[PDB]
Design a protein around this ligand. Sequence first.
Ligand SMILES: O=C(O)CC[C@@H](NC(=O)c1cc(CNc2ccc(/C=C3\SC(=S)NC3=O)cc2)ccc1F)C(=O)O
Ligand SMILES: [Cl-]
Ligand SMILES: [Cl-]
Ligand SMILES: [Cl-]
Length: 435
Amino acid sequence: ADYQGKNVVIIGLGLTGLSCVDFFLARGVTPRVMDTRMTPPGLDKLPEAVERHTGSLNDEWLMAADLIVASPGIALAHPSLSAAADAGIEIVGDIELFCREAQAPIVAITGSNGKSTVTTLVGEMAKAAGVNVGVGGNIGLPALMLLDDECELYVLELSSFQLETTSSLQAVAATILNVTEDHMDRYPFGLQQYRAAKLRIYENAKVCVVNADDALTMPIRRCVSFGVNMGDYHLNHQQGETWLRVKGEKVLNVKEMKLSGQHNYTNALAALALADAAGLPRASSLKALTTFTGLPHRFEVVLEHNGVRWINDSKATNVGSTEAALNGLHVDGTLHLLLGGDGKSADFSPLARYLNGDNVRLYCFGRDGAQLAALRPEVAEQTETMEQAMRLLAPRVQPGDMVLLSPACASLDQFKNFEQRGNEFARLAKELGSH
Ligand SMILES: O=C(O)CC[C@@H](NC(=O)c1cc(CNc2ccc(/C=C3\SC(=S)NC3=O)cc2)ccc1F)C(=O)O
Ligand SMILES: [Cl-]
Ligand SMILES: [Cl-]
Ligand SMILES: [Cl-]
């Protein structure tokens, strides 16, 4: 693609928006930037030569554009964008710009849960093979910041929103790990619309990797599969022990892994399927499975002290992710579960099946605190903030208990992002969890 001479408008700043601005400037094109936020992240880093409009969209700019580059954070359904689309003005996002330029194969990973873990794992598999790998996209560096002629493989986590604006991906291996209700504030045609955005990832993929246990991961019209009891890649339980298997053959006893739990084992299978499809040596891929320690904010033990485990699962921003934390969870004493934030119109009811018994307390905060407390009012307390909830629960914590932040919601009503929420949790855990 050649952008020279084009009127380019970038919607949405932050680090990803800035990478788009830099991409065009480096190619001798000065874009214009708009953002519905008054002082969006990164505004102070935007070069003065770049015109910007903030606090709303500017329809004069949009309707004048030859190319609109939309952040995943702006809905394509926004009236100003739909008007531009109706006028035949081309709309793409950062991932599309990247795909048009990339000179190495791309492994592309999406899903409602597991996508950052699987992306990171495949990245580690590549590193163990001595491959010069660029890992990022929806986590780490924005994709355009990874673009480098020396890269031999890219491994990109892609959100449903980025996929909506992407048309030129031809992944060497693409997966949807699972699809569970999320982002309903952005998908007014509900679960199937959200699924449809993710299904885009398979278009022109050389290999598709699907979840044998999740029918929604399958194309609507074969694919390689992973699963628990079935799939090309699957688990073999051997009295106390679990193995990763490929087509009947044992490849790894999960005792060699640092990660634990069934859904981490299926994330391991999906990573291995992708790595195999990308042509990575199977041996170095298995080695990476043994060294990988997990991501911050993903069921992360931030303090184990005085008989109490304090677990930061702030990355649980939907119901499916909290279900994964709670399903099969062992707690010796009482589970003190922190729930809250912006639930994005999700149905929280699927959590209620994990919340019976005499050994659960709920501490519910943020925008949807009351709806969360409603899951089981008799064991629930509601506060405005997570700090209030922590200070409420801490005096009640006894040796043997677990304190779990796995909030099932976005943090964006009260925090910059789920990392900030997790870090605040960890700070407070360390204060409240020792003498
Ligand atoms: O950190 C959390 O707690 C929540 C995270 C969590 N985030 C998203 O929904 C999400 C966020 C991003 C990040 N990128 C942006 C970029 C711009 C904006 C906001 C804009 S752009 C514009 S113009 N006007 C805006 O307000 C928001 C997110 C990308 C894909 C996603 F699935 C969620 O899954 O609930
Ligand atoms: Cl507006
Ligand atoms: Cl119980
Ligand atoms: Cl208190």
